[PDB]
mmCIF file of all heavy atoms in Angstrom:
data_model
loop_
_atom_site.group_PDB
_atom_site.id
_atom_site.type_symbol
_atom_site.label_atom_id
_atom_site.label_comp_id
_atom_site.label_asym_id
_atom_site.label_seq_id
_atom_site.Cartn_x
_atom_site.Cartn_y
_atom_site.Cartn_z
ATOM 1 N N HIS A 15 45.398 62.830 -1.818
ATOM 2 C CA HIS A 15 44.391 63.831 -2.221
ATOM 3 C C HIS A 15 43.686 64.504 -1.057
ATOM 4 O O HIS A 15 42.997 65.510 -1.258
ATOM 5 C CB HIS A 15 43.372 63.258 -3.251
ATOM 6 C CG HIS A 15 42.365 62.296 -2.705
ATOM 7 N ND1 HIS A 15 42.659 60.940 -2.528
ATOM 8 C CD2 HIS A 15 41.072 62.517 -2.381
ATOM 9 C CE1 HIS A 15 41.532 60.400 -2.069
ATOM 10 N NE2 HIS A 15 40.558 61.323 -1.938
ATOM 11 N N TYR A 84 42.443 63.889 -9.626
ATOM 12 C CA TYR A 84 43.490 63.363 -10.510
ATOM 13 C C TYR A 84 42.994 63.245 -11.924
ATOM 14 O O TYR A 84 41.815 62.958 -12.159
ATOM 15 C CB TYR A 84 43.887 61.914 -10.080
ATOM 16 C CG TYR A 84 44.564 61.782 -8.731
ATOM 17 C CD1 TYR A 84 43.895 61.234 -7.658
ATOM 18 C CD2 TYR A 84 45.889 62.117 -8.572
ATOM 19 C CE1 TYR A 84 44.525 61.069 -6.428
ATOM 20 C CE2 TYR A 84 46.523 61.972 -7.348
ATOM 21 C CZ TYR A 84 45.840 61.448 -6.268
ATOM 22 O OH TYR A 84 46.479 61.298 -5.062
ATOM 23 N N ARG A 87 44.261 57.869 -14.988
ATOM 24 C CA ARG A 87 45.633 57.352 -14.913
ATOM 25 C C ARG A 87 45.649 55.915 -14.376
ATOM 26 O O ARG A 87 44.603 55.407 -13.969
ATOM 27 C CB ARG A 87 46.441 58.285 -13.961
ATOM 28 C CG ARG A 87 46.060 58.043 -12.464
ATOM 29 C CD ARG A 87 46.271 59.242 -11.569
ATOM 30 N NE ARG A 87 46.662 58.870 -10.188
ATOM 31 C CZ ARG A 87 45.831 58.389 -9.263
ATOM 32 N NH1 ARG A 87 44.556 58.110 -9.574
ATOM 33 N NH2 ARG A 87 46.274 58.117 -8.038
ATOM 34 N N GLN A 89 46.767 53.746 -11.280
ATOM 35 C CA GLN A 89 47.211 53.874 -9.904
ATOM 36 C C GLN A 89 47.931 52.566 -9.551
ATOM 37 O O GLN A 89 47.413 51.464 -9.832
ATOM 38 C CB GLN A 89 46.005 54.114 -8.979
ATOM 39 C CG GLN A 89 46.422 54.146 -7.475
ATOM 40 C CD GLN A 89 45.415 54.837 -6.582
ATOM 41 O OE1 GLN A 89 44.765 55.847 -6.972
ATOM 42 N NE2 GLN A 89 45.283 54.322 -5.342
ATOM 43 N N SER A 99 31.528 51.499 -0.856
ATOM 44 C CA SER A 99 32.409 52.653 -0.798
ATOM 45 C C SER A 99 31.655 53.840 -1.405
ATOM 46 O O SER A 99 30.833 53.662 -2.313
ATOM 47 C CB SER A 99 33.679 52.397 -1.623
ATOM 48 O OG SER A 99 33.265 52.151 -2.976
ATOM 49 N N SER A 119 41.124 54.001 -0.955
ATOM 50 C CA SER A 119 41.609 55.018 -1.884
ATOM 51 C C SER A 119 40.689 55.186 -3.084
ATOM 52 O O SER A 119 40.670 56.269 -3.688
ATOM 53 C CB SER A 119 43.024 54.644 -2.345
ATOM 54 O OG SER A 119 43.546 55.568 -3.291
ATOM 55 N N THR A 120 39.938 54.151 -3.470
ATOM 56 C CA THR A 120 39.041 54.263 -4.644
ATOM 57 C C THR A 120 37.736 53.532 -4.367
ATOM 58 O O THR A 120 37.630 52.748 -3.412
ATOM 59 C CB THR A 120 39.689 53.675 -5.949
ATOM 60 O OG1 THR A 120 39.708 52.241 -5.879
ATOM 61 C CG2 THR A 120 41.056 54.222 -6.277
ATOM 62 N N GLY A 121 36.757 53.742 -5.247
ATOM 63 C CA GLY A 121 35.524 52.993 -5.192
ATOM 64 C C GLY A 121 34.838 52.935 -6.543
ATOM 65 O O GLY A 121 35.054 53.778 -7.412
ATOM 66 N N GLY A 122 34.007 51.925 -6.697
ATOM 67 C CA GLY A 122 33.187 51.724 -7.889
ATOM 68 C C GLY A 122 31.796 51.283 -7.496
ATOM 69 O O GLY A 122 31.393 51.429 -6.346
HETATM 70 N N1 LIG B 201 42.608 57.303 -5.736
HETATM 71 C C1 LIG B 201 41.865 58.095 -6.512
HETATM 72 O O1 LIG B 201 42.181 58.379 -7.669
HETATM 73 C C2 LIG B 201 40.557 58.582 -5.915
HETATM 74 C C3 LIG B 201 40.564 60.100 -5.651
HETATM 75 C C4 LIG B 201 39.227 60.537 -5.051
HETATM 76 C C5 LIG B 201 38.058 60.116 -5.937
HETATM 77 N N2 LIG B 201 38.122 58.682 -6.266
HETATM 78 C C6 LIG B 201 37.137 57.787 -6.019
HETATM 79 O O2 LIG B 201 37.219 56.623 -6.363
HETATM 80 C C7 LIG B 201 35.925 58.307 -5.259
HETATM 81 C C8 LIG B 201 34.767 57.338 -5.294
HETATM 82 C C9 LIG B 201 33.845 57.381 -6.339
HETATM 83 C C10 LIG B 201 32.742 56.557 -6.350
HETATM 84 C C11 LIG B 201 32.552 55.627 -5.309
HETATM 85 C C12 LIG B 201 33.445 55.574 -4.269
HETATM 86 C C13 LIG B 201 34.540 56.410 -4.277
HETATM 87 CL CL1 LIG B 201 35.725 56.196 -3.026
HETATM 88 O O3 LIG B 201 31.537 54.694 -5.341
HETATM 89 C C14 LIG B 201 30.460 55.005 -6.259
HETATM 90 C C15 LIG B 201 30.936 55.629 -7.564
HETATM 91 O O4 LIG B 201 31.818 56.743 -7.341
HETATM 92 C C16 LIG B 201 39.389 58.237 -6.850
#
Side-chain angles (χ1 to χ4, degrees):
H15 73 277
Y84 294 108
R87 75 207 213 284
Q89 175 160 324
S99 60
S119 178
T120 73

